[PDB]
């Protein structure tokens, strides 16, 4: 909604912050298997239930 509580907005901001990918430099480390963030979601693909 337009109106939201203070704590609820910060938990909304963190969900925005965690919807990012692996930085390129992290992918060039030796013996690295993490290429994509499998905890990714999109607004029109999955609702985050909060």
């Amino acid at each position: 909604t337009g109106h939201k509580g203070f704590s609820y907005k910060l938990k909304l901001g963190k969900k925005i912050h965690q919807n990012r990918g692996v930085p390129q430099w992290f992918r060039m480390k030796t013996g690295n298997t993490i290429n994509y963030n499998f905890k990714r979601r999109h607004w029109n693909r999955r609702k985050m239930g909060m």
């Binding site: 203070f6 907005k9 910060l10 909304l12 901001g13 925005i16 912050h17």
Partner: protein, 60 residues
Amino acid sequence: VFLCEQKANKTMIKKAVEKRYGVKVIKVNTLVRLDGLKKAFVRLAPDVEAMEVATKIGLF
């Protein structure tokens, strides 16, 4: 336009800006961004030029 801690109010932000930079503040407007940082809009007294304060800070 500064970025401050969310746990600071317009009264403490106004005092801190004056103390840190030796200027006069007549108006503070704040908004809390989605990430968590509190963006503050600080307007300085008419006899203080804000453009020269920016060069001293480092924006120019």
